[PDB]
Amino acid sequence: EDLELSLQKSDQDKASKDHQIRNLNDEIAHQDELINKLNKEKKMQGEH
Amino acid sequence: EDLELSLQKSDQDKASKDHQIRNLNDEIAHQDELINKLNKEKKMQGEH
Task: Say which DSSP state B47 is in.
Answer: T
Is B16 in CB contact (< 8 Å) with chain A? Answer: no
Technique of determination: cryo-EM
B3 backbone dihedrals φ, ψ, rounded to 5°: -75, -20
Q: HEC string of chain A?
A: CHHHHHHHHHHHHHHHHHHHHHHHHHHHHHCHHHHHHHHHHHHHHHHC
Determine, for residues A4 and B3 on separate chains, whether the beta-carbon distance falls below 8 Å: yes
Q: What is the resolution of this structure in A?
A: 4.2
Q: Does B44 touch chain A (CB under 8 A)?
A: no
Cα separation of A20 and A15, whole Å?
Answer: 8
Mutation target for A interface from B38, B44, B45, B48: give the one with most A CBs within 10 A: B38
